[PDB]
Amino acid sequence: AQVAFREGDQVRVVSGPFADFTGTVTEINPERGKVKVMVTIFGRETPVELDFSQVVKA
């Protein structure tokens, strides 16, 4: 039993100043290929939109 991705999971950022945080998958877009996760920067929530090409599974 294996899986590529699952809603409600946690994924880290790709790079940049945010290359040390994760997010909470709220919704997915298979038809296109996007992903939304709620990250936390400076000790505060921050909902941002990304894509598998800018995130990683942890």
CATH number of the domain where residue 35 is located:
2.30.30.30
Beta strands in 1-58 (DSSP E): 10-13, 22-29, 34-40, 45-50, 55-57
Beta bridge partners of 45: 40
Residue partners of 24: CB distance under 8 A and separation at least 6: 8, 10, 37, 38
d(CA 27, CA 31): 12
d(CA 38, CA 18): 12
**What residue numbers bound the domain in which 6 lies?**
1-58
Q: What number of CA atoms fall less than 13 Å from residue 56's CA on the CB side?
A: 9
18: nearest Cα among 51, 54, 52, 53? 54
Residue partners of 40: CB distance under 8 A and separation at least 6: 21, 46
24: nearest Cα among 37, 42, 43, 41? 37
Q: Determine the distance from the C-alpha atom of residue 1 to the mean position of all C-alpha atoms in its chain, rounded to a whole number.
A: 23
d(CA 42, CA 27): 24
Q: How many domains does the chain have?
A: 1
